[PDB]
Design a protein around this nucleic acid. Structure first.
Lengths: 79, 106, 147
RNA sequence: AAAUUAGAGUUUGGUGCUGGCUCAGCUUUCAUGCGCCGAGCGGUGGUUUAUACACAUGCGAGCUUAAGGCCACGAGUGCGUAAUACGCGAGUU
RNA sequence: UAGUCGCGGCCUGGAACGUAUGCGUGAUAUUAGAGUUGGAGUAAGUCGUAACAGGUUGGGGUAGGGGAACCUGCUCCAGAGUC
RNA sequence: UGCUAGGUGACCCAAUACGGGCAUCGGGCAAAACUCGCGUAGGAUUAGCGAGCUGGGUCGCUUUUUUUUUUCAGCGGCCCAUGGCUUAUCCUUAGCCUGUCUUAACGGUACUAGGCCACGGUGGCACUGAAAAGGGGCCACGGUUCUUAUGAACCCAGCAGUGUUGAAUUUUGGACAAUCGCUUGAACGGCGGAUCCAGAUGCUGCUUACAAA
RNA sequence: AUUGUUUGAACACCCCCCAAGCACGUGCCAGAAGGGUCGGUAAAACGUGCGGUGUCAGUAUAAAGCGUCUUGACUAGGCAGGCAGCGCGUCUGAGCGUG
């Protein structure tokens, strides 16, 4: 998955990972990545996008990223 | 193996009704509303229908039910069942549609 | 790497080579033999028709010349007429000289004696080759004596 | 702990062949009648199957410090192509 | 050291070639169809005996003759009877 | 060549103290583009290929850049060797493969999603870009409208929707919140008929009597 | 955690294949059928009521693809005898080839 392909296309990348954002009864997030090619791709300069960087930091195999520079009232009812 | 058999094996995927042209149902305008006498040992005057169909070609159609109301310039829906009692005719007029509707008290 | 017979050399610095490659067909479970033709660069034009050559991929030189000749394995022996007349001279010289030296011993008896002793010298030679290779042993198998 | 072969009726005074037709199998449609349209959670699927026919109207690539800087990725169809195609396998200047 | 200098960047120029296009003149392809003929289908219009022991023993063959079924030769096959 | 991280700045912006853009360098991995080995619908009522139909030389084939060593092709012009193929050409069908259905298997054939290619009403061509055009540029065609007729404007095989034909084909819906893309150094920023959610509609898996806590 | 009781509605079929049968109606007429076909005045198929079998918010018809179909046979047909050995030979194709 480079910049060219879409989300669901056939990709040379092996895994975005075993992933399940749905909460599951306790320890609510999923099991994380399978491994050993994730470090190769992030080593090779393949970029992460914003939330995979948050998820990789949150799993603690990478350090986390601070998101907010300022606060203005976000609307939670947009959905 | 034997190389003649190796070259011995897409044909014509033949529609066994060649007037519906692979489709199940084609409409059309009835050219003539007429009856005929059938092959022995049948002798009841069966009522038929020559229809100028959707595909621009013509074939005869069996008229079912206790009478009907079809005249000249009349649209029908033609189905794919044949009537055996006269040769060469393969079409059935389904009832529950257009100017040919259902009979009274069926 | 292909090892395939030449069929054409009428052609500048380039020989047309045919190779017997066998393709599978899945329908009848039978390997069908086809032969495809390739155009290949040679450099010395030492390939007479009937030579068994080794072609290999190199840089493409043309639209359709794509391999290069590596080595000619078995040379095709060719018709030289003057050398053929020389073999006529040597061969009937050998026949007439042998019949004159031989010619009671009808000449068949002498030649068949020479072929018998030649075969005997051969059999003694390859038997001693087997003797030096194996030692004193029954000719049961060499696979037994490979231990 | 490897999960692997259904026929019958039809031809003839009858019997057996000879091959064909049909029905019972599975899958498939905004198929066509007749009948319900209680309400929710979902999967999915439409190649407007066809017309690569003609398109009313509206919207789909705009962002950003007048000016300049970035917008070939996504969506649709299969005309053409029987082979610079597509697939598979080796090596790349 | 002040008009020089400019290998190098931007600009009026001609032009082989290159569609669609025109009267000639070819190919493959399409339905319209003049117009002829054949196959098939059909309960009662109809003329003779091919066929079957089957009444001239028929026919694969190539030509002749007759309002019609057909027959005339010449080798074959017996896949017609039958002693 | 394209991305991401570094390191640099006689640059620009921000800064009660320091980070961004902007230029250049180089490490990482990467795409791209070419080449060849094979596979591939039938037709003799297609039998020779109306052609450079294949090869060799010569040039043109629009850059040097780390140590011993380094840089395709008929693509065009010219000679030239006269050969190259013979299911060769020509016709017509057809996007291709995995798929899906079935069969016990071998096989035989309409989809799912998705891989690649092709095309954008038709045909020709160029700019820029490293690489070319589905709502970018020019011309010719064919349509659709209008002119006071001289000429201009537009091209749904994008979404909804209209019309013919069809047995049959859906709502002129909401929204950037989730992705993912494009963009922007504030701002949970801006946009996206991709998508995500709702509709109509075949197939399906799965519930369904009310009352009351 | 709380309490009461219960099986709809249709469609097709009902001679054999194929599960299911009788009455009146009309008698080769109206008709049905996928095939064999049934009606030619005592219809177990067609007009209708009763009764029953399949599927069930579905059901039948129509088509289409596969199988059945060894019905293009490689697994897996054959070829005097249904249909199928070319009139015969020369024959360096391809293929099979240690006396």
């Amino acid at each position: 998955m480079e910049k060219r392909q879409a989300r669901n296309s056939g990709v040379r990348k092996e895994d975005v990972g075993w992933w399940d954002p749905n909460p599951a009864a306790d320890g609510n997030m999923h099991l994380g990545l399978n491994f050993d090619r994730l470090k190769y791709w992030l080593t090779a300069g393949a970029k992460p996008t914003d939330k995979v960087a948050e998820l990789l930091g949150h799993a603690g195999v990478l350090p986390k990223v601070p998101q907010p520079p300022h606060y203005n009232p976000r609307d939670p009812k947009d959905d | 193996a034997t190389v003649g058999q190796l070259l011995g094996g897409a044909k014509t995927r033949k529609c066994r009704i060649r007037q519906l042209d692979g489709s199940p149902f084609k409409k059309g305008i009835c050219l003539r509303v007429y009856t005929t006498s059938p092959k022995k040992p049948n002798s009841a005057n069966r009522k038929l229908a020559k229809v100028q169909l959707s595909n621009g070609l013509k074939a005869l159609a069996y008229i079912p039910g206790e009478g009907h109301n079809l005249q000249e310039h009349s649209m029908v829906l033609v189905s794919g069942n044949g009537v055996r009692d006269l040769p060469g005719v393969k079409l059935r007029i389904v009832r529950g549609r257009y100017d040919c509707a259902g009979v009274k008290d069926r | 790497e292909f090892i395939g017979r030449v069929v054409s050399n009428r052609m500048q610095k380039t020989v047309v080579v045919a190779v017997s490659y066998v393709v599978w067909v899945p329908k009848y479970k039978v390997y069908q033999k086809r032969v495809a033709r390739h155009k290949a660069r040679d450099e010395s034009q030492a390939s007479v028709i009937g030579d068994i050559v080794r072609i290999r991929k190199s840089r493409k030189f043309s639209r359709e010349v794509s391999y290069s000749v590596v080595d000619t394995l078995r040379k095709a022996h060719v018709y030289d007429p003057a050398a053929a007349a020389a073999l006529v001279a040597t061969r009937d010289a050998a026949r007439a000289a042998a019949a004159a030296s031989t010619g009671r011993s009808d000449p068949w008896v002498a030649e068949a004696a020479r072929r018998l002793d030649a075969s005997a010298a051969r059999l003694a030679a390859l038997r001693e080759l087997y003797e030096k290779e194996v030692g004193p042993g029954v000719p049961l198998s060499g696979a037994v004596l490979a231990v």
